[PDB]
Design a protein around this ligand. Structure first.
Ligand SMILES: NC(=O)CC[C@H](N)C(=O)O
Ligand SMILES: NC(=O)CC[C@H](N)C(=O)O
Ligand SMILES: NC(=O)CC[C@H](N)C(=O)O
Ligand SMILES: [Mg+2]
Ligand SMILES: [Mg+2]
Ligand SMILES: [Mg+2]
Ligand SMILES: [Mg+2]
Ligand SMILES: [Mg+2]
Ligand SMILES: [Mg+2]
Ligand SMILES: [Mg+2]
Ligand SMILES: [Mg+2]
Lengths: 15, 443, 443, 15, 15, 15, 223, 15
């Protein structure tokens, strides 16, 4: 889930 | 130093400042800020404004953590285009752990600690006179960046420059009204390209400008209808933006790399130096050439280096010994692209230099014929190791060497590989438009 | 055999054939042909027609090199969709150097040449049962592939009787009119993914099938207005097209991996055969997943294998043993995607098979436990190595494993690495939109 | 791992 | 591969 | 040159 | 072609960047039902009639190009590396030789001249080949060193060190290399000739003076 | 003069 948040984190830096 | 407390304070009252922005720089380099009002300038100077600090680990912030902001009084500056309802100033800041101690991790204070190590070795300074290159693209009605270059000029061109010069002057006649000492500006190889080069400076003092620049360039380019971008290689087949880093070590107020009656007027001080920068050129490229696109720049051709070696006359050298000498005697590291964190670059660069001078490594055979005529075999034959082919191989080797990892330091190192393998898996798991046009009708 | 000189020739005239294609399959794995008029059929059967057989080297052909064209009578088939004034048939062909000696580097001949070796080892037939998957996209007024999927189905759906499977049938109902024995059809995990599986048959009689397949699929899809595509992972985010391969060694009409009173009724032949496979899995990758996109399929989460392990009830194993035994007892290599030269695959797949049975290599512990739940460090604490992450990682592992080299041939080897170092060579110097959106506002 | 492709395996199954 | 830089340099000088 | 040969080859099987 | 709404043009290199069309010629001589180029006991199974004929084409090759490749466009198909045979040399192999000796023997034994293109005049073209193909059978000419290594990877200057001279570069570079060769002249007809030499120069002098937009992308703006 | 005929004779052939 950090992995979802991190995942989440990752959708607005890699875009 | 340069500005004094009562000094700043009078500049603000007289200049009428209504908004102070506390700049520091993140790990991927991005110059972020924390904006406060002239009303709070006091608690800002007192080094007492706290903030979630993991804003530095970039898109790999795990935990919110309170940190301080110790502003350098000299990195002070006011902004002109924001000159209406209270101009709007900005400092640059030393992030510090909560207790009192500097933040191990702060990109910046990491150059200062790779700089302490310099003194402990006897040197007095370090100097960086960087030549940073940049495309200027047009925006649209909407205001979006397009893929239309601003001009069609070429190397050192004139009349065609005017559309991008009309800006290159605007950019260059504002930085003067900002305190800069810009050596000079011309026009680069491919269309839309441009480059301004400023006066050398001490490591921190300079990177401080690196940051600034990248920012005033984009601010002024948008205020013209175009979009300044620093992508290493934005367009395919066309030439990439670079950002050469001419270095030089001092030791008691005097160029340590200079030596009159010596082979190439070079000292046995600059040799061990060139020797070290030749001894981690592949293991500090992850840092210097840190993004996925920086490796679409390093393709043989467009003047970009592709192989490890040095000279004072060569097509695309990894090292390049400017000819002018004396207090100008310098080593030019040409691989560094403007998509590299100023701060962390100077770190691996002054650390791969000072592991030679100490260990006394001995530099190799400077080249003159061609490193392009012998393949990857006839090259990996004489200490000519090609720079990495992708961010990923670029990381593979970065981890592979101790001297470097100690160069950032556990926390910085770890979050970086961490922040960077992520960047890689996406681009690696992604299906692009190319992969598609190929295989859709062949397969 | 199946057909005779006489059978072929009377068939043509009783059925009215007016045009003959002489089909072969190039290295890159594209189906090529050289067309002749019913008149020339004879000189064709006399094995006399010639051509520039560097058409096989693919796009790394360098020298018009003459070559004959020996059709295999049993690979004969007339095409129905035609008949428009002359039905048009087709044969497959063994290429033969100028001197009656098979062309060593002909994809096809290589499988037969790999087949000889097996006989000397004793197995009578080596059989393959393909599960090849595909997307049908929609076309436009212009007639251009678009990104519009065909359906909005998923695993095994009953796609209403007009649009989803009205295509799936049309294909299946036609292949029977061409003499294929389709075991069946369904839908697949994704929106627009299909699959039709056919019976098993000798490697060479099945590769043919494969080639033929891809073709007809593609010619009946346009007939319906859509674009067929067997490309590995066309759409990001969505599951890919795999082409699993069920193998099964025989010994004088009996299945080899079958052992009733044994460990999972698995002979010490299959325990060894599985062993050769498990051994060269990383080496034979570049051939079974041969293009730059085959690797944006090999990522975890889509059912496709990413690790080197063998079980029979598991996540995403690189190997799979369909429960049923008897003559059916068969291994299932699931990392093989439809855009790899079926021919070279059987080869390198039937090759690593023979490297084990021989040296009598030893099966490892079948993975049933949590293979996905660990890291590549913790799994590294086992015999579970990763499958490459890019075509380049996959080419290196290939040039090194000697037995792999010998499976293609000094020739089919050379040009293959050649055409593939170039395919990789271009996809990485290129600049993909992806790179530009990240680094244009950020850097 | 599997939770991202399954995470996808599911996204389209549920749209 | 000054020939590609020159190839870089000349594709422009000339289009 | 052959490279332009293989070049003028590899702008057709690569497009 | 039209019938199916398309256009068909036998033009040498209609599109740049893209391969041109090569109308290759396979040549073989007989003397009484039996292929003369052929020879049981011999190297490359090749009769002397052949090495003799070969040296022929290899001599005059540079010359009859004005007649085997007569268009202004034809010189833009013969650029390096598109398989176009840019150099005068014979082989049974190589990137793109001017003469390719197939592998079939028996009666197919033959000489392929790939210089020739679809926008040539079949008949004239042909009389000039039979032409240099015979100067050689008659004056017993000495064939040269077949192409091994490969000459593409060489300067125009190390090649020049072998009997290797390039092909004409322009339709103008040809014509003159045609006029100065006594055997194409007498080869064609002192009339077919005055009207050919001429018919083309005028062609050339019409290409030569126009102002091709190319120059404009190039000069209109910069200068 | 033929030169204007030729000339007029040419403008066809060359267009
Ligand atoms: N110096 C140059 O003109 C080359 C610029 C390119 N970005 C490299 O470096
Ligand atoms: N049969 C399946 O669903 C597996 C297909 C998946 N694309 C892999 O291979
Ligand atoms: N058939 C071919 O070999 C094509 C060669 C090319 N069209 C010329 O030269
Ligand atoms: Mg410079
Ligand atoms: Mg420069
Ligand atoms: Mg070759
Ligand atoms: Mg299936
Ligand atoms: Mg399967
Ligand atoms: Mg030919
Ligand atoms: Mg005689
Ligand atoms: Mg004369």
């Amino acid at each position: 889930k950090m992995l979802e948040g991190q995942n989440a984190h990752f959708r607005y830096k890699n875009r | 130093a340069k500005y004094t407390r009562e000094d700043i304070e009078k500049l603000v009252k007289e200049e009428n400042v209504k908004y102070i922005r506390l700049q520091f720089t993140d790990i991927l380099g991005t110059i972020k800020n924390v904006e406060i009002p002239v009303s709070q300038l006091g608690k800002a100077l007192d080094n007492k404004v706290m903030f979630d600090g993991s804003s530095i680990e970039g898109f790999v912030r795990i935990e919110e953590s309170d940190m301080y902001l110790y502003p350098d009084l000299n990195t002070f500056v006011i902004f002109p285009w924001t000159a209406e309802k209270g101009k709007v100033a900005r400092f640059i800041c030393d992030i510090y752990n909560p207790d009192g101690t500097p933040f191990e991790g702060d990109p910046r204070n990491n150059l200062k600690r790779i700089l302490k190590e310099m003194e402990d070795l006897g040197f007095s300074d370090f100097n960086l006179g960087p030549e940073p290159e940049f495309f200027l693209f047009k925006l649209d009605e909407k205001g979006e960046p397009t893929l239309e270059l601003n001009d069609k000029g070429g190397y050192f061109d004139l009349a065609p420059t005017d559309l991008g010069e009309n800006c290159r002057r605007d950019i260059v006649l504002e930085l003067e009204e900002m305190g800069f000492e810009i050596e000079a500006s011309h026009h680069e190889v491919a269309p839309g390209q441009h480059e301004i080069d400023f006066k050398y400076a001490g490591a921190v003092r300079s990177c401080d400008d690196i940051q600034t620049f990248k920012l005033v360039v984009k601010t002024i380019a948008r205020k013209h209808g175009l979009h300044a971008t620093f992508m290493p290689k934005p367009l395919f087949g066309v030439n990439g933006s670079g950002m050469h880093c001419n270095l030089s070590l001092f030791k008691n107020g005097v160029n340590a790399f200079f030596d009159e009656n010596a082979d190439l007027q070079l000292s046995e001080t600059a040799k061990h130096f060139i020797a070290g920068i030749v001894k981690h050129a592949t293991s500090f490229t992850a840092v210097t050439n840190p993004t996925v696109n920086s490796y679409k720049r390093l393709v043989p051709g467009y003047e970009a280096p592709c192989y490890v070696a040095w000279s004072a006359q060569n097509r695309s050298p990894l090292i390049r010994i400017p000819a002018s000498r004396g207090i100008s005697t310098r080593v030019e590291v040409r691989s560094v692209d403007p998509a590299a964190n100023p701060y962390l670059a100077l770190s691996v660069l002054l650390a791969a230099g000072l592991d030679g001078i100490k260990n006394k490594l001995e530099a190799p055979a400077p080249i003159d014929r061609n490193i392009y005529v012998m393949s990857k075999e006839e090259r990996m034959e004489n200490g000519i190791v090609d720079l990495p082919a992708t961010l990923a191989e670029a990381l593979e080797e970065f981890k592979s060497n101790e001297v470097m990892v100690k160069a950032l330091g556990e926390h910085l190192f770890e979050h970086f590989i961490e922040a960077k393998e992520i960047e890689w898996d996406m681009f690696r798991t992604q299906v692009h438009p190319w992969e598609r046009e190929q295989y859709m009708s062949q397969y």
